[PDB]
């Protein structure tokens, strides 16, 4: 039971994490044919063969 | 890291077919094997720079080419192998030049985890095989003429009259290693390349000799040089 009940981007993605990879996506959650990932988090992965610290 | 070997080409007539293979090994990051990454096939005219050909990911997809090659050209990867592959057809005498095998740098997939790149990056091409020459060209192959070039001092193997490039020289299988000079083949009037080859030695002598490796004719020479 809400009252009331929106959603928002807390962490856009690109915008929020440039120093780490946030295309990652799975054949466990295939949306269209192709595979891809949950709508409302990233899995974030290592970029350029670093996964710099995160905060 | 990983390491790449193009194979399978050579000399065919105006508008056969030819197919080359790039085979990988070794791996990098996390136990990454080619599989993981995607590759392009680039190659090279003699004398000219680098074009790109053709494009595959990790796991197959997204292929693309280059204009000049697309409907001729077919890119293809079994990674059971781990080995690409790129078949040509109705090769044009300007598709001459040396074929190269590139991997880009970026991780497109890791199947166990599960875990894919939902884009193709394409990018840096941090690793490259040797590369494989293809010469187009109806002319007949011929085998090399080597006669040798007796004599700090020097001594050399003149391989005269062959068609098409590439050979191979070592001297006593790399035993003079220093001050080598295999010069650059010129193409002689008859239409057959020419070749020296040179090592520098001090008053010191011990015999030499110079072995010379065709592979379009199965030739494998080593040739003696005694005053
Ligand atoms: C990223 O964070 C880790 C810990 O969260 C840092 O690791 C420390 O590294 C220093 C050496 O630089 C060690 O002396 C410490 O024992 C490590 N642990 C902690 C808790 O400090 C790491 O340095 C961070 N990376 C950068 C670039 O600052």
């Known amino acids: 039971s809400v009252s009331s009940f929106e959603r928002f981007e807390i962490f856009p993605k690109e915008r929020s994490w440039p120093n780490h990879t946030t295309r990652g996506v799975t054949a466990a959650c295939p949306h269209a044919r192709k595979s891809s990932f949950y709508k409302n988090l990233v899995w974030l992965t290592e970029a350029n063969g670093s996964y710099p610290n995160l905060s | 890291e990983v390491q790449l070997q193009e194979s399978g080409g050579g000399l065919v007539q105006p508008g056969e077919s030819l197919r080359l293979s790039c085979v990988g090994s070794?791996?990098?990051?996390?136990?990454?094997?080619?599989?993981?990454?995607?590759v392009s096939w680039v190659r090279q005219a003699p004398g000219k720079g680098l074009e790109w050909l053709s494009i595959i990911n990790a796991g197959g997809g997204d292929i693309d080419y280059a204009d000049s090659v697309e409907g001729r050209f077919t890119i293809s990867r079994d990674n059971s192998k781990e080995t690409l592959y790129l078949q040509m057809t109705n090769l044009r005498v300007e598709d001459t030049g040396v074929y190269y095998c590139?991997?880009?740098?970026?991780?497109?997939?890791?199947?166990?985890?599960?875990?894919?790149?939902?884009?193709?990056?394409?990018?840096?091409?941090?690793?490259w095989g040797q590369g494989t020459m293809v010469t187009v060209s109806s002319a007949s192959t011929k085998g090399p003429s080597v006669f040798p070039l007796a004599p700090t001092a020097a001594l050399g193997c003149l391989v005269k009259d062959y068609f098409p490039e590439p050979v191979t020289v070592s001297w006593n299988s790399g035993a003079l290693t220093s001050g080598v000079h295999t010069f650059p083949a010129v193409l002689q009037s008859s239409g057959l390349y020419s070749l020296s080859s040179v090592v520098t030695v001090p008053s010191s002598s011990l015999t030499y000799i110079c072995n010379v490796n065709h592979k379009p004719s199965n030739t494998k020479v080593d040739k003696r040089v005694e005053p």
């Open positions: 590139a991997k880009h740098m970026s991780m497109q997939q890791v199947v166990s985890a599960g875990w894919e790149r939902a884009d193709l990056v394409g990018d840096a091409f941090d690793v």
């Open positions: 070794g791996s990098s990051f996390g136990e990454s094997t080619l599989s993981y990454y995607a």
